[PDB]
Design an enzyme around this catalytic site. Sequence first.
Site, PDB file in Angstrom:
ATOM      1  N   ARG A   1      34.401  55.050  46.887  1.00 38.07           N
ATOM      2  CA  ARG A   1      35.071  56.060  46.206  1.00 38.07           C
ATOM      3  C   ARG A   1      35.212  57.509  46.931  1.00 38.07           C
ATOM      4  O   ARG A   1      35.672  58.309  46.429  1.00 38.07           O
ATOM      5  CB  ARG A   1      34.561  56.151  44.851  1.00 38.07           C
ATOM      6  CG  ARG A   1      34.323  54.914  44.171  1.00 38.07           C
ATOM      7  CD  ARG A   1      33.585  55.211  42.647  1.00 38.07           C
ATOM      8  NE  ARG A   1      33.185  54.110  42.026  1.00 38.07           N
ATOM      9  CZ  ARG A   1      32.655  54.179  40.865  1.00 38.07           C
ATOM     10  NH1 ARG A   1      32.392  55.325  40.310  1.00 38.07           N
ATOM     11  NH2 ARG A   1      32.257  52.949  40.196  1.00 38.07           N
TER      12      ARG A   1
ATOM     13  N   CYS B   1      39.762  43.604  37.372  1.00 39.79           N
ATOM     14  CA  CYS B   1      38.987  43.215  36.317  1.00 39.79           C
ATOM     15  C   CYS B   1      39.657  42.098  35.472  1.00 39.79           C
ATOM     16  O   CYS B   1      39.153  41.917  34.384  1.00 39.79           O
ATOM     17  CB  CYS B   1      38.612  44.439  35.514  1.00 39.79           C
ATOM     18  SG  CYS B   1      37.617  45.641  36.299  1.00 39.79           S
TER      19      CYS B   1
ATOM     20  N   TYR C   1      35.336  36.255  24.892  1.00 42.70           N
ATOM     21  CA  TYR C   1      34.608  35.993  25.742  1.00 42.70           C
ATOM     22  C   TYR C   1      35.079  36.523  27.103  1.00 42.70           C
ATOM     23  O   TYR C   1      35.095  35.975  28.076  1.00 42.70           O
ATOM     24  CB  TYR C   1      34.479  34.614  25.858  1.00 42.70           C
ATOM     25  CG  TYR C   1      33.805  33.976  24.509  1.00 42.70           C
ATOM     26  CD1 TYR C   1      34.519  33.133  23.835  1.00 42.70           C
ATOM     27  CD2 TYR C   1      32.418  34.637  24.100  1.00 42.70           C
ATOM     28  CE1 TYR C   1      33.636  32.721  22.541  1.00 42.70           C
ATOM     29  CE2 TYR C   1      31.803  33.918  23.307  1.00 42.70           C
ATOM     30  CZ  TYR C   1      32.530  33.088  22.398  1.00 42.70           C
ATOM     31  OH  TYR C   1      32.050  32.731  21.204  1.00 42.70           O
TER      32      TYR C   1
ATOM     33  N   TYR D   1      24.193  48.597  37.932  1.00 47.29           N
ATOM     34  CA  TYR D   1      24.760  47.283  37.271  1.00 47.29           C
ATOM     35  C   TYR D   1      23.383  46.780  36.517  1.00 47.29           C
ATOM     36  O   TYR D   1      22.476  46.275  36.820  1.00 47.29           O
ATOM     37  CB  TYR D   1      25.235  46.338  38.081  1.00 47.29           C
ATOM     38  CG  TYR D   1      26.251  46.665  38.977  1.00 47.29           C
ATOM     39  CD1 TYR D   1      27.192  47.821  38.634  1.00 47.29           C
ATOM     40  CD2 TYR D   1      26.488  46.210  40.221  1.00 47.29           C
ATOM     41  CE1 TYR D   1      28.137  48.259  39.451  1.00 47.29           C
ATOM     42  CE2 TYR D   1      27.584  46.782  41.055  1.00 47.29           C
ATOM     43  CZ  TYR D   1      28.555  47.586  40.542  1.00 47.29           C
ATOM     44  OH  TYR D   1      29.402  48.155  41.247  1.00 47.29           O
TER      45      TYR D   1
ATOM     46  N   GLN E   1      34.058  51.241  50.417  1.00 47.91           N
ATOM     47  CA  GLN E   1      34.640  50.357  49.468  1.00 47.91           C
ATOM     48  C   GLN E   1      35.541  51.099  48.594  1.00 47.91           C
ATOM     49  O   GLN E   1      35.453  52.675  48.244  1.00 47.91           O
ATOM     50  CB  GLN E   1      33.313  50.091  48.419  1.00 47.91           C
ATOM     51  CG  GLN E   1      32.690  48.894  48.931  1.00 47.91           C
ATOM     52  CD  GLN E   1      31.858  48.286  47.731  1.00 47.91           C
ATOM     53  OE1 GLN E   1      31.840  48.735  46.730  1.00 47.91           O
ATOM     54  NE2 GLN E   1      30.708  47.371  48.049  1.00 47.91           N
TER      55      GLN E   1
ATOM     56  N   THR F   1      28.239  41.428  41.514  1.00 44.20           N
ATOM     57  CA  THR F   1      27.131  41.242  40.462  1.00 44.20           C
ATOM     58  C   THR F   1      27.640  42.204  39.547  1.00 44.20           C
ATOM     59  O   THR F   1      26.677  42.366  38.767  1.00 44.20           O
ATOM     60  CB  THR F   1      25.875  41.240  41.011  1.00 44.20           C
ATOM     61  OG1 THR F   1      25.365  42.514  41.643  1.00 44.20           O
ATOM     62  CG2 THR F   1      25.646  39.960  41.797  1.00 44.20           C
TER      63      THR F   1
ATOM     64  N   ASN G   1      38.967  31.270  42.765  1.00 44.19           N
ATOM     65  CA  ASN G   1      39.158  32.160  43.785  1.00 44.19           C
ATOM     66  C   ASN G   1      38.984  31.973  45.443  1.00 44.19           C
ATOM     67  O   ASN G   1      39.651  32.718  45.922  1.00 44.19           O
ATOM     68  CB  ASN G   1      38.324  33.536  43.115  1.00 44.19           C
ATOM     69  CG  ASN G   1      38.523  34.048  41.923  1.00 44.19           C
ATOM     70  OD1 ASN G   1      37.579  34.343  41.072  1.00 44.19           O
ATOM     71  ND2 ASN G   1      39.737  34.123  41.397  1.00 44.19           N
TER      72      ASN G   1
ATOM     73  N   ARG H   1      36.704  39.970  29.649  1.00 39.46           N
ATOM     74  CA  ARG H   1      36.259  41.189  30.240  1.00 39.46           C
ATOM     75  C   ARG H   1      36.506  42.300  29.290  1.00 39.46           C
ATOM     76  O   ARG H   1      36.087  43.630  29.384  1.00 39.46           O
ATOM     77  CB  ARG H   1      36.562  41.388  31.685  1.00 39.46           C
ATOM     78  CG  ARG H   1      36.291  42.993  32.117  1.00 39.46           C
ATOM     79  CD  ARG H   1      34.829  43.236  32.092  1.00 39.46           C
ATOM     80  NE  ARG H   1      34.142  42.536  33.211  1.00 39.46           N
ATOM     81  CZ  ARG H   1      34.568  42.570  34.465  1.00 39.46           C
ATOM     82  NH1 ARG H   1      35.838  43.314  34.544  1.00 39.46           N
ATOM     83  NH2 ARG H   1      34.076  42.046  35.504  1.00 39.46           N
TER      84      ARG H   1
HETATM   85  N1  LIG Z   1      32.971  50.476  44.540  1.00 38.65           N
HETATM   86  C1  LIG Z   1      32.508  50.317  43.480  1.00 38.65           C
HETATM   87  O1  LIG Z   1      31.835  50.914  42.720  1.00 38.65           O
HETATM   88  C2  LIG Z   1      32.735  48.819  42.722  1.00 38.65           C
HETATM   89  C3  LIG Z   1      33.583  48.988  41.486  1.00 38.65           C
HETATM   90  C4  LIG Z   1      33.835  47.776  40.950  1.00 38.65           C
HETATM   91  C5  LIG Z   1      33.513  46.573  41.581  1.00 38.65           C
HETATM   92  N2  LIG Z   1      32.897  46.408  42.733  1.00 38.65           N
HETATM   93  C6  LIG Z   1      32.557  45.639  43.422  1.00 38.65           C
HETATM   94  O2  LIG Z   1      33.529  44.300  42.945  1.00 38.65           O
HETATM   95  C7  LIG Z   1      32.820  43.218  42.369  1.00 38.65           C
HETATM   96  C8  LIG Z   1      33.947  42.475  41.518  1.00 38.65           C
HETATM   97  O3  LIG Z   1      34.681  43.310  40.879  1.00 38.65           O
HETATM   98  P1  LIG Z   1      35.925  43.030  39.644  1.00 38.65           P
HETATM   99  O4  LIG Z   1      35.003  42.307  38.522  1.00 38.65           O
HETATM  100  O5  LIG Z   1      36.658  43.800  39.381  1.00 38.65           O
HETATM  101  O6  LIG Z   1      36.641  41.708  40.205  1.00 38.65           O
HETATM  102  P2  LIG Z   1      37.947  41.597  39.836  1.00 38.65           P
HETATM  103  O7  LIG Z   1      38.694  40.264  40.500  1.00 38.65           O
HETATM  104  O8  LIG Z   1      38.802  42.836  39.952  1.00 38.65           O
HETATM  105  O9  LIG Z   1      37.716  41.215  38.406  1.00 38.65           O
HETATM  106  C9  LIG Z   1      36.800  40.051  38.121  1.00 38.65           C
HETATM  107  C10 LIG Z   1      36.737  39.518  36.700  1.00 38.65           C
HETATM  108  O10 LIG Z   1      38.048  38.765  36.359  1.00 38.65           O
HETATM  109  C11 LIG Z   1      37.931  37.673  35.477  1.00 38.65           C
HETATM  110  N3  LIG Z   1      37.856  36.526  36.280  1.00 38.65           N
HETATM  111  C12 LIG Z   1      36.859  36.133  37.302  1.00 38.65           C
HETATM  112  N4  LIG Z   1      37.186  35.054  38.016  1.00 38.65           N
HETATM  113  C13 LIG Z   1      38.343  34.604  37.347  1.00 38.65           C
HETATM  114  C14 LIG Z   1      39.339  33.411  37.851  1.00 38.65           C
HETATM  115  N5  LIG Z   1      38.759  32.533  38.653  1.00 38.65           N
HETATM  116  N6  LIG Z   1      40.564  33.470  36.917  1.00 38.65           N
HETATM  117  C15 LIG Z   1      40.948  34.359  36.201  1.00 38.65           C
HETATM  118  N7  LIG Z   1      39.959  35.434  36.071  1.00 38.65           N
HETATM  119  C16 LIG Z   1      38.869  35.796  36.572  1.00 38.65           C
HETATM  120  C17 LIG Z   1      36.301  37.783  35.258  1.00 38.65           C
HETATM  121  O11 LIG Z   1      36.291  38.466  33.933  1.00 38.65           O
HETATM  122  P3  LIG Z   1      36.119  37.622  32.494  1.00 38.65           P
HETATM  123  O12 LIG Z   1      34.537  37.997  32.171  1.00 38.65           O
HETATM  124  O13 LIG Z   1      36.974  38.467  31.464  1.00 38.65           O
HETATM  125  O14 LIG Z   1      36.151  36.215  32.814  1.00 38.65           O
HETATM  126  C18 LIG Z   1      35.840  38.741  36.239  1.00 38.65           C
HETATM  127  O15 LIG Z   1      34.793  39.559  35.625  1.00 38.65           O
HETATM  128  C19 LIG Z   1      31.669  43.625  41.743  1.00 38.65           C
HETATM  129  O16 LIG Z   1      30.777  42.711  41.652  1.00 38.65           O
HETATM  130  C20 LIG Z   1      31.267  44.825  42.651  1.00 38.65           C
HETATM  131  O17 LIG Z   1      30.472  44.517  43.801  1.00 38.65           O
HETATM  132  C21 LIG Z   1      32.519  47.426  43.344  1.00 38.65           C
END
Ligand SMILES: NC(=O)c1ccc[n+]([C@@H]2O[C@H](COP(=O)([O-])OP(=O)(O)OC[C@H]3O[C@@H](n4cnc5c(N)ncnc54)[C@H](OP(=O)(O)O)[C@@H]3O)[C@@H](O)[C@H]2O)c1
EC number: 1.1.1.-
Lengths: 112, 112, 326, 326
Positions: C154, C213, C227, C55, C179, C21, C298, C229
């Site tokens: 981390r 991301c 629109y 968040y 994580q 989220t 995904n 990221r």
């Molecule tokens: N340890 C930590 O502190 C930490 C750090 C980071 C993340 N996390 C966890 O990881 C989760 C998500 O990480 P992440 O956002 O980095 O995931 P990611 O897979 O690395 O990036 C996700 C982003 O890619 C784009 N996307 C999403 N679905 C897609 C698809 N089917 N095809 C193409 N592009 C797509 C979206 O951005 P658009 O909005 O541009 O579409 C989405 O925000 C978080 O909810 C969190 O729980 C944890």
Amino acid sequence: SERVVINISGLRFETQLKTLAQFPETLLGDPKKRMRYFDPLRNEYFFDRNRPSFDAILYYYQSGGRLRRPVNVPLDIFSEEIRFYELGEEAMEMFREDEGYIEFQRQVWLLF
Amino acid sequence: SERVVINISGLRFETQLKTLAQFPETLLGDPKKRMRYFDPLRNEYFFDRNRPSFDAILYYYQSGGRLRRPVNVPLDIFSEEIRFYELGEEAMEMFREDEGYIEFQRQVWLLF
Amino acid sequence: LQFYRNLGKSGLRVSCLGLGTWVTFGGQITDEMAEHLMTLAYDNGINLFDTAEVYAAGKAEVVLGNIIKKKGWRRSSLVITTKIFWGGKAETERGLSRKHIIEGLKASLERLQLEYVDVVFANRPDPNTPMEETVRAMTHVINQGMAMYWGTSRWSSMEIMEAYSVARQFNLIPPICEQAEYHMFQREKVEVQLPELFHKIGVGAMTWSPLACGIVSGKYDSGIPPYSRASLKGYQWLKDKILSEEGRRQQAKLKELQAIAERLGCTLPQLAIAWCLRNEGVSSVLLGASNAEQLMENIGAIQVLPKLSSSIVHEIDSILGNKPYS
Amino acid sequence: LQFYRNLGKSGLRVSCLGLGTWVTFGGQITDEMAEHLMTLAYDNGINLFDTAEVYAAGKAEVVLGNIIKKKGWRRSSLVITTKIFWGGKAETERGLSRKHIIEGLKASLERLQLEYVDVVFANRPDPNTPMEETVRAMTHVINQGMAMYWGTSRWSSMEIMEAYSVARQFNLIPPICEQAEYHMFQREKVEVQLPELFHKIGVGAMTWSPLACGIVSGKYDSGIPPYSRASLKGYQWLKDKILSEEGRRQQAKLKELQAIAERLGCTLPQLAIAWCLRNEGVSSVLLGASNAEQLMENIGAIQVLPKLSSSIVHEIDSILGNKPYS
Ligand SMILES: NC(=O)c1ccc[n+]([C@@H]2O[C@H](COP(=O)([O-])OP(=O)(O)OC[C@H]3O[C@@H](n4cnc5c(N)ncnc54)[C@H](OP(=O)(O)O)[C@@H]3O)[C@@H](O)[C@H]2O)c1
Ligand SMILES: NC(=O)c1ccc[n+]([C@@H]2O[C@H](COP(=O)([O-])OP(=O)(O)OC[C@H]3O[C@@H](n4cnc5c(N)ncnc54)[C@H](OP(=O)(O)O)[C@@H]3O)[C@@H](O)[C@H]2O)c1
């Protein structure tokens, strides 16, 4: 500086990881080698082996080379523990040296 | 692989159950024999006996036969502990051999 | 092969994939979309749903907390996780002290409208708090019924191992998971340091950002799509690394990986997600999504996982050219 | 001889017999019958009443929970036990993880309308959960006031002993009892492996199925009687083993045991139940009953226990011919 607990048949030994990593070739110096003896419930490495011999083995890491058989440990038993802990062929031959241990004509050269 | 804790007058000994089960005839090898010495509060077998002697007894299970009296344990005290742990008549006579120990005419054959 | 897998050595069964989220819930996407994504993910078998107290300043847990209560899902069927660190602008409201761990988790549970999270995480290592204090607090909130387990994020392997060795010292509860970032351009940690812990002390890895991301998805090969990221407010840092010279060579290698995706009969995101699950230490992958199409795409990475052979893996490791020296 | 006996070494006093709620409560028999059986068993001195979260998908505890509340019996006079494992169709709702042990017992207490069970059981060993995690959870629910004690069921002696050695390792609460099947055709476990634990670590045995779900009663010597345990839906597995060739030789040996029952002035069920209580490791026998006649007959096995001499026991061990090699 990470502490390492070594359990020898109930006898507790503690040291710093850097002391065992000083010799990366041996058992306790190689993390992959000593992995099979780790106890994740006590955070220690258990060995079901001889107990009076390990005083000199762990001191071989602290002194960084010295391998002196204990006066109460037999010569054969201590030497077989060096093979298990894999201290190296260089330290093994130094232990023996420190203990005191140094066709047409091939058949005619046998009966003479 | 089940761990077994043996308490010798405060001295802690640990081993694997398969090491003691290697000799099912002795005390610690027979579960019914060692039952009378188990402590269900600490999960250990307590013995109110001599302490320097048990290094060689537990090694007799690990080595699987070797029974060497410790250099600091008297000969009579160590030999009386082998009787208690019941290592067997074969291992007892091997210990002595390793230590160094090998009517009409019946009355006339006495005064001669 | 197998869908559900144990998070580390522990008996907690999580799906190989999960819904995060971050950015989206309560921020980028609407709450109506967030409900649609969870409902799709939950109806597809995913039970692990991750959040954090930072968040959207807690609005992510409020959203996540409302979806769980609105849908009426059995709490025993969900695996809800939250991360504790940045719980406010005050001095005593960040870190891993006994005070903020308890206050922060109690506040997160309040927003989530849940009695307990399944795992509470340390969002990053806090060098201003002793390890004994952090382990005792994490053990405390577990025994109080606010968390089933606790893990790190981390943290280095040396910091994770210390929390274990301190827990064994004081008869406390060691951490069960870690994580760490893991995508095709960040792989040094999950493939070198963490695997030793999964066998020594059995700490699982819950990787995050499998597509960096969205960079690995390949949408930034032309520019910064609207629109996206990178176009969002506060994510100029992402737009900087995307349009940078280093970030352009990443997009160049995606063209070679795009051939492998079409060759295996899948998309580029599905390849990179399945590529993350190819390890034994990776217990789950946290997916991001801003719409139903991205999320449902995904989830298709489960089918790509069998197609990943050593031939395909070594071909990808040659295109990337960043295989860490073991 | 003595009626009440300590469950293992612990100070929990249970009657030598007890009423189970499997198949019957909330399933086979009506709730009006279930009240009549408990009232009869409770007025006959039985205080141990056993259930599980899987029986009738929790409707057994609902029934058992209503009878206790309807009759207004003093909670201090009852020994209520429940077994935790199969708590739902979801992935996180089965096993012995810290999550389901707490969630499952909290749900069982909710159905039972009780603050705490006297003993909470592990219905079967869970190889997907570490022993430390299961012992810590069982110790947790005890300290929280949800259970007085905890025991195992279907565990091997090696698994029971491990839970003890782990409890001593982390200063936790070891298990006090073990539920194992024990009738005249299943006797290898309770007579060989368990007796060593009752003397080493003092784990008692709460045997179940003393009549092998009614097979030892001798009602299946002709066919499958209507309204029986074999005729019920979902118990085709029992009808298979009864009508099998192996199951017919069991009924043949019952004729020889029937002579001993009439010789000792009792019934065949009373003989087999009293035959189970002849051991010191057996702390109690969980009785089944679908009507008041069966239950009141089974309670009569207390009188048959004195009549069981070594002559009668060895005669039965010769008819059965399955005395385990010690
Ligand atoms: N340890 C930590 O502190 C930490 C750090 C980071 C993340 N996390 C966890 O990881 C989760 C998500 O990480 P992440 O956002 O980095 O995931 P990611 O897979 O690395 O990036 C996700 C982003 O890619 C784009 N996307 C999403 N679905 C897609 C698809 N089917 N095809 C193409 N592009 C797509 C979206 O951005 P658009 O909005 O541009 O579409 C989405 O925000 C978080 O909810 C969190 O729980 C944890
Ligand atoms: N550890 C475990 O997971 C486990 C497993 C099984 C059982 N248990 C416990 O054991 C309890 C009962 O087990 P069980 O049902 O196997 O007991 P059982 O004595 O082996 O069999 C009982 C069945 O026999 C028949 N019966 C009952 N009373 C009778 C009588 N007076 N004369 C002749 N037949 C009679 C009934 O079947 P009809 O309906 O055909 O009359 C009854 O359901 C359960 O409530 C449970 O608590 C525990």
